[PDB]
């Protein structure tokens, strides 16, 4: 994380609009649908046999919400992204054993969901600002793999 | 892979894309160059600036190559034969860059067709793009 | 991809492998489980110990599946149809594990056939194994 | 880097035998041949259009030797593998811009090359010890990407 004043203004101004109730679920959902292997991790979530069954699962939308929190957390903590995520890293690292590349996927799908929700307002430049944050988080996450 | 279902989706979304195909392919690169600056290393003789007509005309190129894929999806290899050579042999493009490109392509798709960019369509696009990428890097393989 | 060259190589090294095919398939898993202990997560009802006859018998299974690929390399998809289901759908194996396995497979190939494990053959095996993996996970795609 | 006494004994005992003149080249060579994209970085090395042309290039075998050095270096400095590699990371990160994943491949091919040279003496257990080290180096390397 660096995020130039311009970039920061872009990131901040966007997350401000973000529907926190439903974007996290939108992104978590899409990860399960796009990267189906990742579903081996939410077997206790219920019926995930169909993307429909995936997109309308209350657990998914319930979980997707905690996921955005951590993001809101980090988005305003670029300073110490590693500090912020120590605990989470630990959970996913030597507790969940989630391959760090999944961390990237999520990030990217989060990028698509944003792009999905903001349309034209999600310009390349804002995208790039977001690419930075997303990868910082994913890097903060797989930190405990060291 | 690419199932009768995927096949349907890809042909669907693109149907939807229409004549803005070229318009999107350029947005994609643009997005790529800004978000993944390292990729910029392949277009040193390109004006990578915002309205660059260079990037503008390349987008159509790519865009058209993707159109060729969709229509010949059941024969990508033979279809992209030439392009694999250019990219793998002649260009020696790092396979990773295809992952970055595909991403921006998706992002672009999403930013313009909120209607059709369903979770299921999203998946089929991603699958399709990976196929394209694999062939275009298949000479490495 | 897999060129007429690749195809030649794969068929050559394996020819070389012979009856020890199964023997190596098990050494491969063993190496995987020790080097990548996270993989062990999938064989919880397996005795993952040194001489495990379970691991022993699986190696032939894997080994035979690879032989099936080689002989049908021009139609992997249809060939491994079943296996893609098992692994992608039913087991939901993280695609990454395929990279890990194939690595150990190579490592085993190399530790046994120093004579035929040329840089050229090494490349063709790698390419081949990537093919198998892509099919085995193409239901995710 | 942890490497149990047993593991360490394994690692050390192996490297001891390692032909430093020719293994590094053997591994660098194989990297260019197996992952041809990687060749984009050694354009100034000469003729690399055939594996033979690759495996018999004096600069490749010349270069492959410095690479083993860094490894001998690290192999005996697992304590501070990030310390040891700061300078190298810097060259590859914001000087060469080599995608960290290639750090992994090299490592892997290094593994096969060892496996190739020691045969049966490169048991699963010693392999595992080496997988640890190889990944430590690769991670020390891509450290400056943060
Ligand atoms: C930036 C990426 C990610 C972030 C920020 C994130 C965040 C979180 C959060 C906030 C929780 C729950 C907190 C709690 O229990 O109090 C969690 C748990 C979990 N994460 Fe993630 N996650 C990410 C990526 C992933 C990926 C890629 C996977 C793999 C499929 C994954 C799998 C899980 C699972 C299965 C749980 C549930 C733990 C349990 O309830 O036992 N996460 N993660
Ligand atoms: C779906 C993915 C891609 C498609 C369909 C595609 C398509 C094309 C096409 C059609 C051309 C020009 C062919 C002609 O002469 O008509 C081209 C050139 C090129 N591509 Fe791609 N490409 C893709 C991904 C990439 C990626 C990921 C990179 C690297 C970041 C890349 C780098 C290049 C370069 C450097 C050129 C040559 C530009 C010039 O000198 O004119 N391409 N590509
Ligand atoms: C491309 C390499 C691979 C091949 C050819 C292969 C082949 C096979 C075969 C033939 C079976 C037995 C199916 C049956 O007859 O019911 C099997 C089962 C299985 N495979 Fe693999 N496999 C490969 C890679 C992997 C990887 C990378 C993993 C993940 C660690 C994995 C995990 C499993 C598991 C957990 C089972 C089920 C065993 C049981 O419950 O009895 N496989 N595989
Ligand atoms: C285990 C991973 C690696 C290690 C330990 C390593 C080590 C080294 C060393 C020791 C040097 C030169 C030292 C000196 O000048 O004193 C070097 C330079 C170089 N490395 Fe690597 N390397 C690794 C991976 C890679 C990869 C994956 C690539 C990409 C193909 C790469 C490309 C290069 C290039 C092109 C140079 C030459 C720089 C120049 O002379 O301008 N290296 N590396």
Task: Report the CATH number that the domain containing residue D121 is assigned in CATH.
Answer: 1.10.490.10
CB A92 less than 6 A from any atom of ligand 1: yes
DSSP helix/strand/coil, B115: coil
CB proximity A40 to C under 8 Å? yes
Burial of A33-58, coded b for 16+ CB within 10 Å and e otherwise, reads: bbbbbbbebbeebeebeebeebbebe
Residue nearest to atom 13 of ligand 4 (CA): D66
Q: Within 10 A of C19 (CB to CB), how many other CB atoms are there?
A: 6
Residue A85 CB partners (closer than 8 Å, separation 6+): A70, A74, A137, A140, A141, A143
Tokens of B62: 């790519």
DSSP H helix total and E strand total for chain D:
7, 0
DSSP helix/strand/coil, C72: coil
Residue nearest to atom 20 of ligand 3 (CA): C87
Q: How far is CA A127 from the centre of its chain?
A: 14
Count CA within 13 A, CB hemisphere, residue B6.
21
Count structural domains, chain A. 1
- Per the annotation, binding residues of B for O2 are 58
* CATH assignment at residue C14: 1.10.490.10
Own/partner pairs, C94-97, CB within 8 angstroms, 24+ separation: C94/A37, C94/A38, C94/A40, C94/A99, C94/A102, C95/A37, C95/C133, C95/C137, C95/C140, C96/A99, C96/A101, C97/C36, C97/C39, C97/C42
Question: Residues D22, D25, D29, D30: is their CA dihedral positive or negative?
Answer: positive
Closest CA to A88 of A106, A67, A104, A102: A67
Contact D122 C36 (CB under 8 A): no
Task: Measure D2 CA to nearest chain B CA, in Å.
Answer: 31
Question: Residues D12, D13, D18, D20: is their CA dihedral positive or negative?
Answer: positive
What technique determined this structure? X-ray
In angstroms, the CA A14 to CA A133 distance is 13
Closest CA to A126 of B34, C123, B36: B34
Residues in chain C within 8 Å Cβ distance of D55: 119
Of A25, A94, A106, the residue with max ligand 1 atoms within 8 A of its CB, to mutate for a pocket test, comes to: A106
Closest CA to A27 of A85, A81, A76, A66: A66
Q: How many residues does chain B have?
A: 141
Closest CA to D75 of D20, D130, D26: D130
Contact D112 C114 (CB under 8 A): no
Of B39, B42, B54, B134, the residue with max ligand 2 atoms within 8 A of its CB, to mutate for a pocket test, comes to: B42
Quote the crossing angle between the two packed helices B4-17 and B53-70, to the nearest 10°. Answer: 140
Quote the crossing angle between the two packed helices D101-118 and D5-17, to the nearest 10°. Answer: 70
CB B36 less than 6 A from any atom of ligand 2: no
Q: Identify which of D112, D128, D131 has the shortest CB distance to residue C122.
A: D112
Q: Quick one: DSSP state of residue C88? A: I
Q: Quick one: DSSP state of residue D35? A: S
Q: Within 10 A of A131 (CB to CB), how many other CB atoms are there?
A: 23
DSSP helix/strand/coil, B106: helix
Question: Residues A30, A32, A38, A41: is their CA dihedral positive or negative?
Answer: positive
Tokens of D128: 């595992």
Residues in chain B within 8 Å Cβ distance of C1: 77, 84, 135, 138-139, 141
Spacing, Cα A67 to ligand 1 middle (Å): 7
Maximal CA-CA distance, chain A? 44
Q: Within 10 A of B4 (CB to CB), how many other CB atoms are there?
A: 6
Residues in chain C within 8 Å Cβ distance of A102: 94
Count structural domains, chain C. 1
In angstroms, the CA B27 to CA B105 distance is 8
Quote the crossing angle between the two packed helices A100-118 and B95-112, to the nearest 10°. Answer: 30
Across the A/B interface, how many CB contacts are shorter than 8 Å? 57
In angstroms, the CA C55 to CA C39 distance is 13
In angstroms, the CA C88 to CA C137 distance is 5
Spacing, Cα C20 to ligand 3 middle (Å): 19
Specify whether the backbone of B3 is left (phi greater than 0), alpha (psi in -120 to 50) or beta: beta
Domain that holds residue D89: 1-146
Closest CA to C26 of C44, C51, C1: C51
The resolution, in Å, is: 3.0
CB B99 less than 6 A from any atom of ligand 2: no
């Amino acid at each position: 994380v660096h995020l130039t004043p311009e970039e920061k203004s872009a990131v901040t101004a966007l997350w401000g609009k973000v529907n926190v109730d439903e974007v996290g679920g939108e992104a978590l959902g899409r990860l399960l649908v796009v990267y189906p292997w990742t579903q081996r991790f939410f077997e206790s979530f219920g019926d995930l046999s169909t993307p429909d069954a995936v997109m309308g699962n209350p657990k998914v939308k319930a979980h997707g919400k905690k996921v955005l929190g951590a993001f809101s957390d980090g988005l305003a903590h670029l300073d110490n992204l590693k500090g912020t995520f120590a605990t989470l890293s630990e959970l996913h690292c030597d507790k969940l054993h989630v391959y760090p590349e999944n961390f990237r996927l999520l990030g990217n799908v989060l990028v698509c969901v944003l792009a999905h929700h903001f349309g034209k307002e999600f310009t390349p430049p804002v995208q790039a600002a977001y690419q930075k944050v997303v990868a910082g988080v994913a890097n903060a996450l797989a930190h405990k793999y060291h | 892979v690419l199932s009768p279902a995927d096949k349907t989706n890809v042909k669907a979304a693109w149907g939807k894309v229409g004549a803005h195909a070229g318009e999107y392919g350029a947005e994609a690169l643009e997005r790529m160059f800004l978000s993944f600056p390292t990729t910029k290393t392949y277009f040193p003789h390109f004006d990578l600036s915002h309205g660059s007509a260079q990037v503008k005309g390349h987008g159509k190129k790519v865009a058209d190559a993707l159109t060729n894929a969709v229509a010949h999806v059941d024969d990508m290899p033979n279809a992209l034969s030439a392009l694999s050579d250019l990219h793998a042999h002649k260009l020696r493009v790092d396979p990773v860059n295809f992952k970055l490109l595909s991403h921006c392509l998706l992002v672009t798709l999403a930013a313009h067709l909120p209607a059709e960019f369903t979770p299921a369509v999203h998946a089929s696009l991603d699958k399709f793009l990976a196929s394209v990428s694999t062939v275009l890097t298949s000479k490495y393989r």
